[PDB]
Structure formats: structure tokens, C-alpha cells
Amino acid sequence: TTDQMEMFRIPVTINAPLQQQVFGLRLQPGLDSVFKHTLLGEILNYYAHWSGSMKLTFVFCGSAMATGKFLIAYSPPGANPPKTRKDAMLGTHIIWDIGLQSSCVLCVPWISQTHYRLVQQDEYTSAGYVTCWYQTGMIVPPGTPNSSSIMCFASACNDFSVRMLRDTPFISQDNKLQ
Amino acid sequence: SDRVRSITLGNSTITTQECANVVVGYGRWPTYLRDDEATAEDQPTQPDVATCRFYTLDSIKWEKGSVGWWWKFPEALSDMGLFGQNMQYHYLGRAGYTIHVQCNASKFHQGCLLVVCVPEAEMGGAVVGQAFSATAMANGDKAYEFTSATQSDQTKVQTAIHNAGMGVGVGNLTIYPHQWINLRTNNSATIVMPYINSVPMDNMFRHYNFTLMVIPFVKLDYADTASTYVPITVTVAPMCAEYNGLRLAQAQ
Amino acid sequence: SDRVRSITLGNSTITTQECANVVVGYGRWPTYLRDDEATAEDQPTQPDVATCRFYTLDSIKWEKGSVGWWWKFPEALSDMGLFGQNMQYHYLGRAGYTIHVQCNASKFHQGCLLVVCVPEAEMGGAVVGQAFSATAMANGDKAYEFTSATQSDQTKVQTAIHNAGMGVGVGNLTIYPHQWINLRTNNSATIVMPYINSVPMDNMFRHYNFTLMVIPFVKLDYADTASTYVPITVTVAPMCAEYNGLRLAQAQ
Amino acid sequence: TVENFLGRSACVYMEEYKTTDNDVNKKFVAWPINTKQMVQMRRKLEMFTYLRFDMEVTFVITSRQDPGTTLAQDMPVLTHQIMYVPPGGPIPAKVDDYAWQTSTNPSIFWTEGNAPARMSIPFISIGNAYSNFYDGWSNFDQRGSYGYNTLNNLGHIYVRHVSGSSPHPITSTIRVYFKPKHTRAWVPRPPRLCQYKKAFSVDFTPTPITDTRKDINTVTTV
Amino acid sequence: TVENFLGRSACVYMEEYKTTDNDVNKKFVAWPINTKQMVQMRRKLEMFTYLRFDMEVTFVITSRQDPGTTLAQDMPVLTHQIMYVPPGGPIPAKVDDYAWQTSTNPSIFWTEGNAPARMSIPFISIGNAYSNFYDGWSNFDQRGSYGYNTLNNLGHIYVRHVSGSSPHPITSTIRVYFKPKHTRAWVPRPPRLCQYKKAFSVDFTPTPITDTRKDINTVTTV
């Protein structure tokens, strides 16, 4: 990363190989770098336990003339993450079609053996992976840019809650200020 | 609008913002085998959500010079998860399908595809009298292609598009369940095929119940756009799948 | 009589002409996870007949000098048809079981086995402080055996029978669901185990929910009969199996 | 009743911390909360596989002046701070560090000469019951940590003197007592026969069933 | 709930004052009340733009005998006085001055060995809510002070030993804790990302959005 703002832009391009992966992330809302500093991750970091479903909203930011279908899936934990769209499609997923409605919501359900998981997540408390693949491809007419960006938003659902108040690892000091 | 469409089978959902209608077999919705139509006496398995869900085959490219493609069923799905597994462990099987062919372009592209399901699409050899092998017509989810020129290779099927490999007029394929994807209005086609056969159930490896053909009747064309090929993707979901005669799995 | 018993799950039926009763967990019959006890939000698969059926493990020989055996669950069933397949493709699983231990002899043979199901049968190493691997306690449907002598091999678990590998008195294992096969009266034992754990569902590879132990408390003995060993066979059927968190299959 | 059997305060830990010392670590205690280090309480809890209860915690803190050549001093009463750091919170590296601000972690400030400090903690497991045993691994691979220790992540207890630096060192000893209340217990197990060897593992040395007598009919004492 | 999140006592200040010293100022503390010097409490309050609440104040005072060559003495128990001087009231210039009479300012007299001193203060702002931030100036000119500091005029806290002059010096340390109660909060803001540099200004040093990983697909730990 050269430019910080690039971190928010998921690349999507024309003539992508069939069934190509767009991204992959591991579900540790309070621990993984992808989530730890978001609103949700920051709140989680003042607690030690969490439980509930999450909303991952994806918004397509290309021109009105571009088209595409993407498969976004959630894989409950297991020994191995999905390496192929064929692997991914066996789990919880939604097939997103681009049109007037620019955004799509993948709602990752609370599927766990325990009622709560740890914010400082471990293997026992593993939550799984979220991956995205090209369902068809991003097709474009003449005179439009060749690649575009997709953005991802995250928030908690109404069945979400946190427990066990604790101090956050994200702030410190060596001296009194002044 | 009615153009909006949402379909959910098992753990998969398909959505379309620009569709035509949904063609249903010969007006017949898929259904499980009734007691008064059965011969095989063993209690069948009906895996339900594990098999009756959407499977997306490998995509293909529609280019200005493309001529047409075909996929034979159930062969095309023989490797798809538990649907394929159940096909292997059972002597008999039965199923209907929801076929969803996807193809998006732009308001400046033009082209038109016929999406048909031909029951018993028995084909002729490239050289009359010369037998060909199964590999000349189906192999997993591999798309097979028709040609403009008449086929010379005797290991192949007679692929000349205008006779659709069956010795009939390609413009008459419309008597079979079909839908058109005219780039100007559609973006997908959905056909629900019920189980059609002369016997109540059948072996799923040995008999290709129907063949899906996607044929460009009006060539893909466009102007100075940076996009070149237009992908075509086929997603299909078995419906009311039931199997009989469990035993060891068939090696292939 | 009540000695007669017939049990049907899926495509399999078990019958016994000389049985005791049927022990049921802690009076708890297996049951699917309720909405008010769930955490994992995805829609689960409940394969039903494909997984909830009887699987017969490899048999073993009960000889005059045998000391006892154990099998850990669900590991023991990891290769059994679709039950094993579903275990591999899912992060979480949940199930109860009908365990049917078979052992027939004759009116002139004598012997008595304890058939117990120990929840969380955490075991000690042959040499204290020395870690052992999974292979020292479970591997498919392979029966593991206890010993009279205390174990010296550090790659093994402390197999001395009188402490049952857990550091407790073997004669007190009766507080766990059990049945006795006294050759003089029985010919089999049937125990229905419900799902018992501190969490609603769990990973099926990483956690052995319970261990089945078959221990001869009274040695096998007989006179001038031509029969030598007496086989012991274990047949078990998962009940109310449901899985969550589908993804790629775990290699092993 | 199980409520009664488990409901008495038992010492689960003890450690010393000095008022003044050259070694930074000798001046405060850092304890990873667990119930496996003190043998008596451990054996009782371990008679059940799963337990669910609220917890009453009482602290007994005593101080003594270290022996030395010159002992004359006049030190005012001492005040201690006991802070609970849930898993993941900032951990103090020395008696005078910022973490002791406790803007969010719970702390108790207690002064010597008074009734022992005490408070209640509710059932805080992420599971439906606390597990005394865990026959499993941390990794899906069937590798990593083995045993109950993999489920122990209750956090730490940190304790220091507030601003108690004295001319000559004073050593304080803290003893922590646990008393479960509003208890529920499931699936009882045989009591531990072999003596305990490790805090975080079931590990043991084979011990005989019981003691012996001369013959199967011996019933006298001499 | 905000009441719960903010409702725990947090250390907002600490300072030392000697029982006997040659320097007049080393014998008493004078603190301009504010909530910006201790980082933890500050970050929490600053998650909201406006706040309205009552305040519970608890003081933790501890004393230690200063090290030296001759330490033998027998000093009776110490008593401290904590006085609140609203803006404009007479400020003490030394431990023994008239201002300590407190005929009108509120004071607390507390003796060591006892439960920490405590009291409640109602919502005392001249505005309808306390402001954590103030994007403006003191002068109409758009000059003068800039920022929240221009709205801080809550007064001072002054503390001394009552008549505690000892033969050999004793150092007392006072720690003041704030616990908001009956709270209301408006217009929430992103939490402070950059470390704090000044007590009376928003000033910071640019800090990156978050930490990095090798590539956009890296999901393993090793």
C-alpha cells in the first residue's frame, strides 16, 4: 500500500479468469486487521466476549454501464478455508447482481458451539471465513473504464451483544501528557 | 417490475434485474415419483437441500465469431457435490432442474441467443457409419461447441450448427422448452425442466435425459468499447432428486 | 417376551432374541438443537436416513486372556459413508447414537462384560509429563486395548485396566450409562446416548465427545468345545445428526 | 448439597510483593486466574465435569517488615490496589505504569487494618458451563494445546502497593479465596486418586488402588 | 448503556505534597479541575461531543516516610483537608494561610486509616451540557484562546495536611477519581486514534489508519 485510501477499494476488472476470487477475509471482528479498527471492532475492543450476526454490505462503485454477478459466501470453521468458488458455494452465500440497487448485504449468521466467542479470538473460538468470487464477470460497453472498485461496510445485527468490560490494547502512554 | 426475480433452493439464491418470464417444462412442474407410477420397491433417498441447490458450471466466452454450445445432463453435473456423489452410489436416479443462463452486455451491444433443452438429443457421427465415444459429446461440465463447417473428424459428432447435430432444421428447435436472450432486453434465461422419460427412473450415467443448447442466432456485435468478449455462465439446480438401488460407487 | 427386540433406522434393522432392556442416556432421548439453544446462525443440514442409520465396525476376538477395549466417538465413525462425509465438510456437528454391542456364546460358556459410554474420557500418558499423539487413542474404527500391566511405552496412553486410563477405580464406571453382557443371560447390549457437551455443537474431529469401553469383569471361560474365541461386534447409528458451517472438506 | 459442599471459601492462590526492591517484578503480582494450583479446591471442583456458578472472591493481605541491620522507621498505613484485567487488556509492566488508571477494568483499593476486601463476580464463561476437563485440542488439526488449559482464558489479577515505597523493605503476601455460590453441577466423576503433579495438566504417577493388609480375612488391628 | 460505560471511577489526577519541606509549594496541592490529563477517562468522555451528568468524586490518599539517614520518630495519625475553590475565590498561598478557614467553600477533613473520602457534585455547568470540544475562540474577534480550554472554568481543588509538620518528612500522594452518574450524551464522535500530546489541546502527530499485512489475501498468522 502506497496510498492509505486504497485500503478501502476492492479491485474488480474486465476479462477476469472465470471463477476468480475477488477477496478473502477471516471472521475475527475484534482481532483481524481488516475489522479491528472499524466502529464495530473498536467497540468490541473494550470487551472480552461477543455474540451475534453481522452485516457486510458491498457497494459497487463503477459506472452505471458496467454489469456483473458475484458470489459472496461465509464458511463456518473447519480445518481448511475454501480455495475455489466450488468450495465456497457449499456454505452460506448470496449471488449479487448489479443493477439500480448498487449495494448488497451478506448477513453472516451466528453459527457457533458456544453462546459467545472471545474478542481475543483463538482456534477454539474460531468463526470462519468470508470470500468473494466472480459469478459471471464484469462486462463493459465501449467507452467506460476497465476496472472499478467495490466497498465493504460492516455493522452488528439486532441479536448482537458484548460482555466482560476490559481496557483496549489500542491506546497507551509512557508519560503523563504535559 | 416483473423483470426482477429471486429464486432460492437450499443454501443458494439467484437474482436478476432484467429478465423475461420463467419457462416451465411442458407446463409441468418437477415432482417426486408417486406410488402408482413406481416399479423399484426400495425406500428412496431424497437428500433435499444437499442436492437440490444451485451449481455454477465453468463459464465460457461469447465472441463475435462464436457459433454455439451444448451440455448434456445429468453428465454435466456428475462432479457437483452431493448430487454427483448420489449419482455414483445409486443404480437409479430421477430429477427435474431449474436452468439459469446468465449473460450481461450493455445498451450498446447487440446479439441474440436461443436457450433450449432438447429431450433425448441423440446425435449423428461426423462420418456416417463411424461410431464415436461418449467423450465426443459429454465430459463433466465441459462445454462442447458446434461449428459452421461440416465436421470431418470421425472421432467427433457432426457439429455443423444448422442441423444441430440431429439432422433437423436448427430454426425449428423452438418446439422444445426455450427462452431467448436478446441483449437488447434480457440478461438471463430461466427454464424449469421436469423429469421426462419413457420409464419412471433411469440410470444417470448411461442416459443423457436432455441436452442444453445455447446458440447465437444473431451474432455478438459492438463498437469501440474496451470490453471484448461477453461471458456466458450456466447455473443449474436439481429439483426433487430421488435415488434407488444403493450399492458401491461407480469408479467414474 | 421383552427379550425380543427390533430397531429400525434408515435402511437398516437390528434384531435380538436374548436382550436385557435398552439403556437411554441420562433418561434423555436424542433430539435436534432448538432455536433457543442455538448460536450458529446458518441453516443446518439434517441428512436424515443417509446418516442416521446403522454402521458396523470391524469385529474383535474375546479370548480367555482378553483385558478390555475402547473406541472414541465420533472418530470411530469418521469413515462411515455419508456420516463421515458430512463430518469432513462441516465445521460443526451434533448427534446422539444408538450403540448395539453384540456377543453370543452358548449355555456352556461363562463371562461378563461391562459396556459403558464415558463422556469426556480424558486420558493420562503412559509416562507422566510425556505428551502422546491422537494416534495413541483413536484412529478410525480401530479397537484400542487396555493391558493388565502398567504401560511403559511413552508413545502410549496409560493402559492399565484397573484405572481405566483415567486415574479412577474401574469398578465405579457404573455411574456412566452402561449395560452388562453376562453370557449366561444376554447376547447383546443397547445404549442410546444423547448429545452431551458444554456447548450446543462442536467440531467432530477435534473433540471426542464420549468413549465406548467394553471390559471383561469376569473372564471368558469354557470347556471342551471346538469354538475358541467369541467375537464381539459393535454396530452404531447416529441419531438427529445436524451440521453447520459448510466449507471445503478436511483432508483427513 | 452441592451448594453446601462447594460453598466455603478456599485459598486458590498466594504470592508476595515487596514495597521496595531493585527488581521491578518483585514489587507487584501478576496472576493468570485459574483453580488448578491449590490442591484442595481443585479436587472438589474436579468431582464434577461441568459447573455453573457465581463467585464470591475474598482477599487476605498481610504485611511484615523484612529483617535487616537497621529497622527503625515509622511507615504510615499501607493501601493496596487489586486490578482485574480481562483477556486482551493492557498489562502493567511496573508498579508505576499508566495501566493502573483502571478507567474501565475493575479495581479494589483497600487499606490495612480493615475487614478483608470482597466482591462477587457472575458466571462469566463464554460457554454454558465451566469445564473442569477438556479431552481435546486447540487446533482443528488435532494439534496445539491439549486439555482443559486450552479453555482457560479468564484473564489476570494484578496487585501493587499504592504509593508505598518505604525506606526499608516491607513484604506483603496476598491470599485469594474463592467461594462458589448459586451452583449447578453436571456429570460427576471419580475423585482424583493420584497426587497432582502439574497445574495445567491431568498428569500423574501410577498409584495403587488402596493400601494392603496381610490376608483376605485379617480384621484385627494388631 | 452510556450510564454503564461511563459509570466506573477513573483516576483523573494525582500529585504529591510533603509534610515538611523548605519549599512552600511542595507542601500543598493546587489543581485546576479538568478531565484532560489522564488518557483513559479522556478518551471515553471524548467519544461524545456533549455530556450532562452528576459527578461522584472519591479520593485515595496514601503517605510514606521519606528515606534518610535518621528515620526514628513516632508521628500520630495524619489528617488532610481538601478544599474546593469555585472560580474567583481566595486561593491559598501556603499551608497555614487564612483561606483554609472555608467559611463558605466546601472542604473535607479526612483521617488516614479510614474508608476513602467521597461526595457527589451536581451538574454544575453554566451551559446546558458540558462540552468536550469547542471549535471556536474566546474573543469575538476570532482571536484569544482556541479550543475547549476556553470553556474550562470549574475552579480548583486545594489540599494540605492539617497540622502535620513532622520531624522527618513524610510524602502524601492524592489520587482523585471521577464517576459520572445520571448521564446523558449527545452527538457521538470517532474515538481518538492518535496518542494525546497536550492536556489542553487536540494536538497530535499523524498516525496511520491501522497496521499492515503482506497482501490483500493474507489470512494466516505465520
PDB file of C-alpha atoms in Angstrom, chain E residues 16-172:
ATOM      1  CA  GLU E  16       2.349  14.723  45.968  1.00  0.00           C
ATOM      2  CA  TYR E  17       2.577  17.103  48.878  1.00  0.00           C
ATOM      3  CA  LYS E  18       5.094  16.939  51.710  1.00  0.00           C
ATOM      4  CA  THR E  19       4.502  17.197  55.396  1.00  0.00           C
ATOM      5  CA  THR E  20       7.653  19.323  55.846  1.00  0.00           C
ATOM      6  CA  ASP E  21       9.902  20.963  53.229  1.00  0.00           C
ATOM      7  CA  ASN E  22      11.771  24.244  52.715  1.00  0.00           C
ATOM      8  CA  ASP E  23       9.820  24.961  49.567  1.00  0.00           C
ATOM      9  CA  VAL E  24       6.366  26.343  50.393  1.00  0.00           C
ATOM     10  CA  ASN E  25       4.844  24.895  47.241  1.00  0.00           C
ATOM     11  CA  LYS E  26       5.998  21.379  47.910  1.00  0.00           C
ATOM     12  CA  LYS E  27       3.661  21.279  50.949  1.00  0.00           C
ATOM     13  CA  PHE E  28       0.202  21.504  49.318  1.00  0.00           C
ATOM     14  CA  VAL E  29      -1.520  20.767  46.008  1.00  0.00           C
ATOM     15  CA  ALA E  30      -3.342  23.243  43.767  1.00  0.00           C
ATOM     16  CA  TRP E  31      -5.174  21.582  40.882  1.00  0.00           C
ATOM     17  CA  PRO E  32      -7.264  23.324  38.165  1.00  0.00           C
ATOM     18  CA  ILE E  33     -10.093  20.793  37.784  1.00  0.00           C
ATOM     19  CA  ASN E  34     -10.297  19.205  34.316  1.00  0.00           C
ATOM     20  CA  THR E  35     -10.654  15.754  32.669  1.00  0.00           C
ATOM     21  CA  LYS E  36      -7.915  16.022  30.043  1.00  0.00           C
ATOM     22  CA  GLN E  37      -4.730  14.923  31.833  1.00  0.00           C
ATOM     23  CA  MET E  38      -5.386  11.213  32.298  1.00  0.00           C
ATOM     24  CA  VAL E  39      -5.631   9.494  28.962  1.00  0.00           C
ATOM     25  CA  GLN E  40      -8.163   6.688  29.660  1.00  0.00           C
ATOM     26  CA  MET E  41     -11.029   8.788  31.072  1.00  0.00           C
ATOM     27  CA  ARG E  42     -10.335  11.440  28.438  1.00  0.00           C
ATOM     28  CA  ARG E  43     -10.755   9.023  25.528  1.00  0.00           C
ATOM     29  CA  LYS E  44     -14.069   7.751  26.913  1.00  0.00           C
ATOM     30  CA  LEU E  45     -15.656  11.139  27.513  1.00  0.00           C
ATOM     31  CA  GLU E  46     -14.373  12.331  24.167  1.00  0.00           C
ATOM     32  CA  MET E  47     -16.439   9.735  22.353  1.00  0.00           C
ATOM     33  CA  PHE E  48     -19.340  12.189  22.774  1.00  0.00           C
ATOM     34  CA  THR E  49     -19.425  15.901  21.971  1.00  0.00           C
ATOM     35  CA  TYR E  50     -21.755  16.961  24.795  1.00  0.00           C
ATOM     36  CA  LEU E  51     -22.335  15.320  28.150  1.00  0.00           C
ATOM     37  CA  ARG E  52     -24.618  16.060  31.096  1.00  0.00           C
ATOM     38  CA  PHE E  53     -24.216  14.243  34.409  1.00  0.00           C
ATOM     39  CA  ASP E  54     -23.822  14.399  38.168  1.00  0.00           C
ATOM     40  CA  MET E  55     -20.393  13.510  39.494  1.00  0.00           C
ATOM     41  CA  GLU E  56     -19.236  11.200  42.268  1.00  0.00           C
ATOM     42  CA  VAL E  57     -15.728  12.096  43.477  1.00  0.00           C
ATOM     43  CA  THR E  58     -13.597   9.652  45.532  1.00  0.00           C
ATOM     44  CA  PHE E  59     -10.136  10.441  46.928  1.00  0.00           C
ATOM     45  CA  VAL E  60      -7.406   7.952  47.653  1.00  0.00           C
ATOM     46  CA  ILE E  61      -4.685   9.442  49.860  1.00  0.00           C
ATOM     47  CA  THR E  62      -1.606   7.461  50.948  1.00  0.00           C
ATOM     48  CA  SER E  63       1.505   8.510  52.904  1.00  0.00           C
ATOM     49  CA  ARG E  64       5.084   7.231  53.058  1.00  0.00           C
ATOM     50  CA  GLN E  65       8.070   8.246  55.157  1.00  0.00           C
ATOM     51  CA  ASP E  66      10.837   9.753  53.069  1.00  0.00           C
ATOM     52  CA  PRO E  67      14.122   7.806  53.105  1.00  0.00           C
ATOM     53  CA  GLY E  68      17.018   9.323  55.041  1.00  0.00           C
ATOM     54  CA  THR E  69      19.841   8.703  57.496  1.00  0.00           C
ATOM     55  CA  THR E  70      17.762   9.061  60.683  1.00  0.00           C
ATOM     56  CA  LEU E  71      14.187   7.770  60.439  1.00  0.00           C
ATOM     57  CA  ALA E  72      13.194   7.101  64.059  1.00  0.00           C
ATOM     58  CA  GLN E  73      10.096   9.101  65.005  1.00  0.00           C
ATOM     59  CA  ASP E  74       6.637   8.443  66.333  1.00  0.00           C
ATOM     60  CA  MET E  75       4.166  10.517  64.387  1.00  0.00           C
ATOM     61  CA  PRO E  76       0.405  10.413  65.311  1.00  0.00           C
ATOM     62  CA  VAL E  77      -2.192   9.734  62.565  1.00  0.00           C
ATOM     63  CA  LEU E  78      -2.422  12.326  59.767  1.00  0.00           C
ATOM     64  CA  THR E  79      -5.486  14.366  58.799  1.00  0.00           C
ATOM     65  CA  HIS E  80      -5.900  16.035  55.407  1.00  0.00           C
ATOM     66  CA  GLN E  81      -8.082  18.878  54.210  1.00  0.00           C
ATOM     67  CA  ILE E  82      -9.406  19.001  50.655  1.00  0.00           C
ATOM     68  CA  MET E  83     -10.991  22.333  49.723  1.00  0.00           C
ATOM     69  CA  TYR E  84     -12.833  23.269  46.573  1.00  0.00           C
ATOM     70  CA  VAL E  85     -12.374  26.873  45.460  1.00  0.00           C
ATOM     71  CA  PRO E  86     -15.008  27.983  42.891  1.00  0.00           C
ATOM     72  CA  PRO E  87     -13.645  30.412  40.251  1.00  0.00           C
ATOM     73  CA  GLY E  88     -12.733  33.737  41.815  1.00  0.00           C
ATOM     74  CA  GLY E  89     -12.458  32.671  45.439  1.00  0.00           C
ATOM     75  CA  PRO E  90      -9.314  33.449  47.515  1.00  0.00           C
ATOM     76  CA  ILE E  91      -6.520  30.991  46.746  1.00  0.00           C
ATOM     77  CA  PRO E  92      -4.170  29.714  49.484  1.00  0.00           C
ATOM     78  CA  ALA E  93      -0.539  30.786  49.066  1.00  0.00           C
ATOM     79  CA  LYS E  94       0.804  28.484  51.823  1.00  0.00           C
ATOM     80  CA  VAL E  95      -0.362  25.639  54.132  1.00  0.00           C
ATOM     81  CA  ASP E  96      -1.030  27.984  57.005  1.00  0.00           C
ATOM     82  CA  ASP E  97      -2.997  30.775  55.334  1.00  0.00           C
ATOM     83  CA  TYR E  98      -6.414  32.254  56.203  1.00  0.00           C
ATOM     84  CA  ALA E  99      -8.131  30.894  53.096  1.00  0.00           C
ATOM     85  CA  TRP E 100      -8.211  27.419  54.677  1.00  0.00           C
ATOM     86  CA  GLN E 101     -10.974  28.644  57.041  1.00  0.00           C
ATOM     87  CA  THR E 102     -13.558  27.563  54.371  1.00  0.00           C
ATOM     88  CA  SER E 103     -16.411  29.562  55.873  1.00  0.00           C
ATOM     89  CA  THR E 104     -18.156  29.134  52.513  1.00  0.00           C
ATOM     90  CA  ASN E 105     -16.128  26.901  50.162  1.00  0.00           C
ATOM     91  CA  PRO E 106     -16.794  23.170  50.648  1.00  0.00           C
ATOM     92  CA  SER E 107     -13.973  21.177  52.349  1.00  0.00           C
ATOM     93  CA  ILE E 108     -13.460  17.623  53.523  1.00  0.00           C
ATOM     94  CA  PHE E 109     -11.409  16.747  56.577  1.00  0.00           C
ATOM     95  CA  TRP E 110     -10.273  13.125  56.396  1.00  0.00           C
ATOM     96  CA  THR E 111      -8.074  10.969  58.672  1.00  0.00           C
ATOM     97  CA  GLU E 112      -5.822   8.146  57.490  1.00  0.00           C
ATOM     98  CA  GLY E 113      -6.768   4.532  58.159  1.00  0.00           C
ATOM     99  CA  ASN E 114     -10.390   5.143  57.190  1.00  0.00           C
ATOM    100  CA  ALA E 115     -12.602   4.496  54.142  1.00  0.00           C
ATOM    101  CA  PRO E 116     -11.619   6.806  51.231  1.00  0.00           C
ATOM    102  CA  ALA E 117     -13.378  10.214  51.254  1.00  0.00           C
ATOM    103  CA  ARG E 118     -16.242  10.719  48.785  1.00  0.00           C
ATOM    104  CA  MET E 119     -19.033  13.096  47.791  1.00  0.00           C
ATOM    105  CA  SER E 120     -21.397  13.992  44.959  1.00  0.00           C
ATOM    106  CA  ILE E 121     -21.445  17.197  42.893  1.00  0.00           C
ATOM    107  CA  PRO E 122     -24.452  18.018  40.713  1.00  0.00           C
ATOM    108  CA  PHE E 123     -24.318  19.107  37.041  1.00  0.00           C
ATOM    109  CA  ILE E 124     -22.585  22.476  37.527  1.00  0.00           C
ATOM    110  CA  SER E 125     -22.056  23.862  34.015  1.00  0.00           C
ATOM    111  CA  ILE E 126     -23.266  27.377  33.113  1.00  0.00           C
ATOM    112  CA  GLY E 127     -24.345  25.805  29.819  1.00  0.00           C
ATOM    113  CA  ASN E 128     -26.961  23.125  29.219  1.00  0.00           C
ATOM    114  CA  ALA E 129     -24.321  20.426  28.781  1.00  0.00           C
ATOM    115  CA  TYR E 130     -20.559  20.084  29.291  1.00  0.00           C
ATOM    116  CA  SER E 131     -18.626  20.464  26.007  1.00  0.00           C
ATOM    117  CA  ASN E 132     -15.773  18.060  25.296  1.00  0.00           C
ATOM    118  CA  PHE E 133     -14.782  20.124  22.246  1.00  0.00           C
ATOM    119  CA  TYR E 134     -15.218  23.746  21.262  1.00  0.00           C
ATOM    120  CA  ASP E 135     -14.300  24.802  17.721  1.00  0.00           C
ATOM    121  CA  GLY E 136     -14.022  28.482  18.494  1.00  0.00           C
ATOM    122  CA  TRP E 137     -12.340  31.410  20.163  1.00  0.00           C
ATOM    123  CA  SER E 138     -12.663  33.359  23.386  1.00  0.00           C
ATOM    124  CA  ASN E 139     -12.696  36.750  21.655  1.00  0.00           C
ATOM    125  CA  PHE E 140     -15.418  37.927  19.251  1.00  0.00           C
ATOM    126  CA  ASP E 141     -12.524  38.987  17.056  1.00  0.00           C
ATOM    127  CA  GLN E 142     -11.775  35.292  16.374  1.00  0.00           C
ATOM    128  CA  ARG E 143      -8.579  35.605  18.486  1.00  0.00           C
ATOM    129  CA  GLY E 144      -7.522  34.697  22.033  1.00  0.00           C
ATOM    130  CA  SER E 145      -7.727  31.081  23.237  1.00  0.00           C
ATOM    131  CA  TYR E 146      -8.802  28.438  20.769  1.00  0.00           C
ATOM    132  CA  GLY E 147     -10.499  25.194  21.749  1.00  0.00           C
ATOM    133  CA  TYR E 148     -12.222  23.533  24.668  1.00  0.00           C
ATOM    134  CA  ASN E 149      -9.885  25.044  27.154  1.00  0.00           C
ATOM    135  CA  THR E 150     -11.699  28.344  26.746  1.00  0.00           C
ATOM    136  CA  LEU E 151     -14.819  26.775  28.372  1.00  0.00           C
ATOM    137  CA  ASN E 152     -12.996  25.218  31.306  1.00  0.00           C
ATOM    138  CA  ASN E 153     -13.625  27.231  34.443  1.00  0.00           C
ATOM    139  CA  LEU E 154     -14.655  24.725  37.047  1.00  0.00           C
ATOM    140  CA  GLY E 155     -12.281  26.063  39.685  1.00  0.00           C
ATOM    141  CA  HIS E 156      -9.570  24.401  41.735  1.00  0.00           C
ATOM    142  CA  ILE E 157      -9.005  21.747  44.337  1.00  0.00           C
ATOM    143  CA  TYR E 158      -6.543  22.591  47.128  1.00  0.00           C
ATOM    144  CA  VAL E 159      -5.242  20.013  49.597  1.00  0.00           C
ATOM    145  CA  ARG E 160      -2.898  20.192  52.615  1.00  0.00           C
ATOM    146  CA  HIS E 161      -2.033  18.286  55.779  1.00  0.00           C
ATOM    147  CA  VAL E 162      -3.903  19.783  58.701  1.00  0.00           C
ATOM    148  CA  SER E 163      -1.321  20.331  61.402  1.00  0.00           C
ATOM    149  CA  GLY E 164       1.005  17.636  60.233  1.00  0.00           C
ATOM    150  CA  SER E 165       4.501  19.008  60.445  1.00  0.00           C
ATOM    151  CA  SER E 166       6.703  16.020  61.224  1.00  0.00           C
ATOM    152  CA  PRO E 167      10.377  15.957  62.389  1.00  0.00           C
ATOM    153  CA  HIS E 168      11.390  13.953  59.292  1.00  0.00           C
ATOM    154  CA  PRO E 169       9.428  14.496  56.070  1.00  0.00           C
ATOM    155  CA  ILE E 170       6.507  12.319  55.034  1.00  0.00           C
ATOM    156  CA  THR E 171       5.181  12.412  51.464  1.00  0.00           C
ATOM    157  CA  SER E 172       1.450  12.032  50.802  1.00  0.00           C
TER     158      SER E 172
END
